[PDB]
Design an enzyme around this catalytic site. Structure first.
Site, PDB file in Angstrom:
ATOM      1  N   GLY A  39     -11.205  -8.929  -1.004  1.00 13.59           N
ATOM      2  CA  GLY A  39     -12.488  -8.792  -0.338  1.00 13.59           C
ATOM      3  C   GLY A  39     -13.377  -9.991  -0.596  1.00 13.59           C
ATOM      4  O   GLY A  39     -14.570  -9.972  -0.287  1.00 13.59           O
ATOM      5  N   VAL A  40     -12.787 -11.040  -1.163  1.00 14.73           N
ATOM      6  CA  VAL A  40     -13.510 -12.265  -1.477  1.00 14.73           C
ATOM      7  C   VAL A  40     -13.499 -13.188  -0.271  1.00 14.73           C
ATOM      8  O   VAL A  40     -12.446 -13.448   0.311  1.00 14.73           O
ATOM      9  CB  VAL A  40     -12.855 -12.998  -2.668  1.00 14.73           C
TER      10      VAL A  40
ATOM     11  N   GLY B 287     -16.949 -10.784   2.477  1.00 16.40           N
ATOM     12  CA  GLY B 287     -18.265 -10.893   1.869  1.00 16.40           C
ATOM     13  C   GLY B 287     -18.359 -11.006   0.361  1.00 16.40           C
ATOM     14  O   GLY B 287     -19.428 -11.321  -0.166  1.00 16.40           O
TER      15      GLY B 287
ATOM     16  N   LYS C 108       0.823  -1.212   0.000  1.00 15.73           N
ATOM     17  CA  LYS C 108       0.000   0.000   0.000  1.00 15.73           C
ATOM     18  C   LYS C 108       0.856   1.261   0.000  1.00 15.73           C
ATOM     19  O   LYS C 108       0.616   2.166   0.800  1.00 15.73           O
ATOM     20  CB  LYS C 108      -0.874   0.023   1.259  1.00 15.73           C
TER      21      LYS C 108
ATOM     22  N   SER D  87     -11.718  -2.146  -0.307  1.00 11.76           N
ATOM     23  CA  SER D  87     -12.845  -3.039  -0.048  1.00 11.76           C
ATOM     24  C   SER D  87     -13.595  -2.935   1.275  1.00 11.76           C
ATOM     25  O   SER D  87     -14.696  -3.477   1.397  1.00 11.76           O
ATOM     26  CB  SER D  87     -12.377  -4.485  -0.206  1.00 11.76           C
TER      27      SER D  87
HETATM   28  O1  LIG Z   1      -8.885  -2.695  -0.608  1.00 11.43           O
HETATM   29  C1  LIG Z   1      -8.144  -3.571  -0.252  1.00 11.43           C
HETATM   30  C2  LIG Z   1      -6.731  -3.681  -0.530  1.00 11.43           C
HETATM   31  C3  LIG Z   1      -6.017  -4.693   0.002  1.00 11.43           C
HETATM   32  N1  LIG Z   1      -6.605  -5.734   0.767  1.00 11.43           N
HETATM   33  C4  LIG Z   1      -5.731  -6.814   1.254  1.00 11.43           C
HETATM   34  O2  LIG Z   1      -6.148  -8.010   0.629  1.00 11.43           O
HETATM   35  C5  LIG Z   1      -6.158  -9.114   1.564  1.00 11.43           C
HETATM   36  C6  LIG Z   1      -7.577  -9.593   1.764  1.00 11.43           C
HETATM   37  O3  LIG Z   1      -7.514 -10.738   2.624  1.00 11.43           O
HETATM   38  P1  LIG Z   1      -8.818 -11.446   3.165  1.00 11.43           P
HETATM   39  O4  LIG Z   1      -9.875 -10.454   3.555  1.00 11.43           O
HETATM   40  O5  LIG Z   1      -9.311 -12.469   2.049  1.00 11.43           O
HETATM   41  O6  LIG Z   1      -8.359 -12.231   4.357  1.00 11.43           O
HETATM   42  C7  LIG Z   1      -5.409  -8.563   2.773  1.00 11.43           C
HETATM   43  O7  LIG Z   1      -4.008  -8.821   2.676  1.00 11.43           O
HETATM   44  C8  LIG Z   1      -5.701  -7.098   2.736  1.00 11.43           C
HETATM   45  O8  LIG Z   1      -4.770  -6.310   3.470  1.00 11.43           O
HETATM   46  C9  LIG Z   1      -8.004  -5.715   1.039  1.00 11.43           C
HETATM   47  O9  LIG Z   1      -8.546  -6.595   1.665  1.00 11.43           O
HETATM   48  N2  LIG Z   1      -8.680  -4.621   0.517  1.00 11.43           N
END
Ligand SMILES: O=c1ccn([C@@H]2O[C@H](COP(=O)(O)O)[C@@H](O)[C@H]2O)c(=O)[nH]1
Ligand SMILES: O=c1ccn([C@@H]2O[C@H](COP(=O)(O)O)[C@@H](O)[C@H]2O)c(=O)[nH]1
EC number: 4.1.1.23
Lengths: 218, 217
Positions: free
Chosen positions: B173-174, B178, B64, B119
């Site tokens: 965000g999968v 949700g 990020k 997300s």
């Molecule tokens: O908008 C964003 C950008 C990055 N991540 C990253 O993507 C992964 C999502 O993981 P999870 O929610 O499937 O566990 C994490 O490493 C998180 O920091 C998000 O979830 N949303």
């Protein structure tokens, strides 16, 4: 609030362990607060925080500009405080939940969060500036006590100080290399952050001493 | 970028032993791993080379990046020196900060992924309103890799519309947050999945299950 010696914080962004340690040691009599960011941490590891604590009597602010989702922000803060950081810098643009996540860990672990509102570089004018006042107001509402604002934009730094009040702690980067003036910045910020003007100088100690001399009356 | 099974594993475990074990358990289903600060700050940047040595997978650094140009350059250099193939950069800090990352990526033979809209719920406060403009900025800058939210398919679709079908788009965000695997792939080239896999009782079964649900894609 933390008692920053000489109202001057060293931004140690050298990426070589030997150089970083040498320079920090040379300005140790002028600065007791050091900001370590990813340039050095990603180059030498989180143990560098431990090494700085061991070698110098300096507080450590981790400039990690935390800007992920709540769940990930919590993990970053936990790992950072576990390594010995006294405080961590967090971005406010990702929203209240992301900031709250950091505040919760800081509270649980007995450390502090610094909320970055507006940034000091030119690009900050594109999206951050327009959201900055609200980001600051959000921080106040969330109970944030420490903030980071731009030395490069006196008018913006002044407004940020008004929003957060006199009781809040405010530090400001962009002094020196980016064009900000030490004295003018201290009209609003509790402490100034200085990196390159000090660590790239032929004599870092002399550079730090010179900056302090220019703000002696403050 | 050819992501096996259109599935990218977000390895956010903070223990080297667990991170390596779980990744190994699902290695047959993926060839792309996203490593972020949770693991890197807990085990060190040497973990990236370790993953390449054990799995040969491609590595995307979810850092990020969101600092000033000068610092962004240093961050990208340290990251690529550690062996990362690509890095995720925030677009909110502006064009100059993104360009700094693009420069280092070009120099070291890597890719920059521009994050336009996040997300989580808080993304609605400030990021969402600037997301379309951030995407247009990416287009103007020549960015070809983007990151958008699985949690808001309509927003992900809008991102795809802006960047075109030639650009590459991955989406987190999968699962835990949700988002639905199949629906997300209607717009994204690949889905990012973390907890649904690495926190599952049987990570391998979880990964296999997600792939089964998108077999037709
Ligand atoms: O908008 C964003 C950008 C990055 N991540 C990253 O993507 C992964 C999502 O993981 P999870 O929610 O499937 O566990 C994490 O490493 C998180 O920091 C998000 O979830 N949303
Ligand atoms: O808006 C911001 C937030 C953080 N920093 C950080 O503050 C330091 C400024 O260093 P320098 O310009 O004095 O060298 C660097 O570590 C940089 O990443 C800024 O410059 N501006």
């Amino acid at each position: 609030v933390m008692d920053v010696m000489n109202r001057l914080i060293l931004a140690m962004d050298l990426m070589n362990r030997d150089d970083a340690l040498r320079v920090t040691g040379e300005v140790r009599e002028y600065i007791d607060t050091v900001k370590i960011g990813y340039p050095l941490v990603l180059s030498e590891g989180m143990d560098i925080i431990a090494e700085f604590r061991k070698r110098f009597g300096c507080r450590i602010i981790a400039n990690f500009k935390v800007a992920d989702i709540p769940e990930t922000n919590e993990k970053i803060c936990r790992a950072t405080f576990k390594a010995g950081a006294d405080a961590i810098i967090v971005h406010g643009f990702p929203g209240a939940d992301s900031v709250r996540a950091c505040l919760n860990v800081a509270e649980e672990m007995g450390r502090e969060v610094f909320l970055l509102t507006e940034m000091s570089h030119p690009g900050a004018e594109m999206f951050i500036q327009g959201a900055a006042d609200e980001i600051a107001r959000m921080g106040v509402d969330l109970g944030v006590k420490n903030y980071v604002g731009p030395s490069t934009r006196p008018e913006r730094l002044s407004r940020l100080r008004e929003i957060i009040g006199q009781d809040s702690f405010l530090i400001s980067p962009g002094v020196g290399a980016q064009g900000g003036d030490p004295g003018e910045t201290l009209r609003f910020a509790d402490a100034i952050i200085v990196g390159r003007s000090i660590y790239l100088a032929d004599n870092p100690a002399a550079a730090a001493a010179g900056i302090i001399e220019s703000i002696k009356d403050l």
